[PDB]
Amino acid sequence: PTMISILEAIEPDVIYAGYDSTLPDTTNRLLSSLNRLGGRQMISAVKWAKALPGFRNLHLDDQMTLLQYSWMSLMAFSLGWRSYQHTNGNMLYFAPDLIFNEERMQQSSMYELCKGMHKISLEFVRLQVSYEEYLCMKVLLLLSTVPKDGLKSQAAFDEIRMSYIKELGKAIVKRNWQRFYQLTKLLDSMHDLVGGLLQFCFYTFVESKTLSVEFPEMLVEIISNQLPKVMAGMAKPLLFHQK
Ligand SMILES: C[C@]12CC[C@H]3[C@@H](CCC4=CC(=O)CC[C@@]43C)[C@@H]1CC[C@@H]2C(=O)CO
Numbered sequence: 001p002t003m004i005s006i007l008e009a010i011e012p013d014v015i016y017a018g019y020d021s022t023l024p025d026t027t028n029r030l031l032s033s034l035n036r037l038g039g040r041q042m043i044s045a046v047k048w049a050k051a052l053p054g055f056r057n058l059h060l061d062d063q064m065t066l067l068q069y070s071w072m073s074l075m076a077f078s079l080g081w082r083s084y085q086h087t088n089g090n091m092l093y094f095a096p097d098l099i100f101n102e103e104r105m106q107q108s109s110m111y112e113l114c115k116g117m118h119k120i121s122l123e124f125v126r127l128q129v130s131y132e133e134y135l136c137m138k139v140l141l142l143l144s145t146v147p148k149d150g151l152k153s154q155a156a157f158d159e160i161r162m163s164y165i166k167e168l169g170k171a172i173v174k175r176n177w178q179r180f181y182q183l184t185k186l187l188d189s190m191h192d193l194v195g196g197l198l199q200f201c202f203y204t205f206v207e208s209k210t211l212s213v214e215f216p217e218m219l220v221e222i223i224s225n226q227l228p229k230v231m232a233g234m235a236k237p238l239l240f241h242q243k
Contacts, residue, residue, distance in 0.1 A: 003053060003163075003167050003170075004132055004135065004136075004167065004170070004171065006051075006052075006053055007052075007132075007135040007136070007139070007167075008131075008132075008135065010048055010051040010052070011048070011135065012041075012044040012045070012047070012048050013044075014082075014095070014096060015037065015040045015041050015044060015095060016037075016040075016095050016096060016097050016098075017033050017034070017036060017037035017040075017094065017095040017097050017098035018033075018036060018037075018097070019033050019095070019097045019098045021097065025103075025104060025107055026107070027107055027108065027109050027211075028211065028212045028213060028214075030104065030107060030108045031108065031109075031110075031204060031211075031213045032213055032214035032215075033098060034094065034098075034108075035213065035214060035215045035216060035219055036214070036216055037094060037095055037098060038075060038216075038218075038219055039215070039216030039217070039218035039219045040216075040218075041075055041078075042071060042075075042218050042219065042222065043218055045067065045071070045074060045075075046067060049063065049066075049067050049142060050063065052139065052142075054159070054160040054163055054164075055139075055142070055143075055160055057156065057160075058151075058152075058153050058156055058157065058160070059152045059153050061152055062151045062152045062153050062157065065147060065151065066142055066143065066145075066146070066151075067142065068222055068225060068226060069145040069146065069147070069226070069229075069235055070141055070142045070143075070144065070145045071222055071226070072194045072197050072198055072201070073141045073144070073145065073190050073191075073194050074138060074141050074142060076117050076120065076190065076193060076194060076197060077120060077137070077138055077141055077190060078138065079092060079093070079094060079117055079120070080117060080118075080120025080121045080123070080124060081120075081121070081124060081134055082094075083117075083118065083120075083121040084121040084124040084125060084129075087099065087121075090102055090105075090118060092105070092114060092117060092118060092121075100114060110200050112196075113193075113196055113197055113200055116193045116196060116197075117193065117197075119193075120186075120190075120193075123186050123189075127179075127182055127183070127186070129183070130171065130175065132171040132174065133168065133171045133172065133183060135171075136164060136167045136168040136171050137168065137183060137186070137187060139164045139167075140161075140164055140165065140168065140187055141187065141190065143157070143160065143161045143164065143238070144187065144190075144237060144238045145191075145235050145236070145237055145238070146235075146236055146238060147229070147234055147235065147236070148233070148234050148235070148236045149234070161238075168180070168183065184240035184241065185240070185241055187240060188237075188239050188240055188241050191237045191239070198226075198230055201223065202223070202227050202230075202231070205223050205227065
């Protein structure tokens with residue numbers, strides 16, 4: 001089987017938030033639901049990541065570190081893709097039972113960040129990103145935020161990352177350098193957006209009582225590790241372009 005076949009085969013099914021739409025929206029309900037969904041998606045992401053060629057050969061500590069650093073990037077990018085594929089206009093397709101319009105983006109109290117995530121879908125539109133390109137790009141996001149002090153299997157990581165860069169190149173050819181330049185530019189743009197998402201995430205995590213935002217155990221585990229590392233500057237982006 002081809003590398004791209006495996007990527008297609010291991011791509012998770014769509015996840016539901018478990019939202020009751022008969023009950024009115026509130027800020028707390030929306031954010032807590034977003035978090036419950038985030039937690040479910042991350043359980044699936046762990047499963048997905050563990051099945052990735054090459055990546056599955058890294059020491060397990062490296063596997064969980066990369067997933068932990070890249071969590072927000074992966075989910076924002078997948079959101080962008082879902083919103084492109086299943087929706088049109090200013091709408092975010094978080095889940096089949098949790099779709100945001102202008103109202104819901106406003107009431108979430110993270111309106112500007114919703115618009116930032118929406119920009120990803122607009123870029124998928126403009127560039128006409130193929131499914132195969134998207135699958136390759138998503139893996140690159142898993143491999144694009146690393147601890148500043150390095151990984152256990154650094155040389156192996158570099159090799160794995162290069163192979164998926166080559167995979168992206170194959171996805172491009174199927175259908176050149178200009179497209180590579182453009183798609184890697186889109187990857188780089190995730191870092192600034194994710195910075196904004198993380199600022200708000202940490203705020204809601206800390207202010208959760210006074211606000212009243214619920215987080216699942218899955219996200220509590222991630223955030224309690226990521227809050228200190230990100231705030232302490234331990235995460236380094238691996239950029240394709242000059243900053
Ligand atoms: C973490 C977060 C709720 C969960 C989402 C995240 C943005 C990206 C994202 C995409 C999804 O498809 C599932 C939810 C999620 C992971 C939001 C950024 C701010 C927001 C909060 O801080 C709510 O407390």
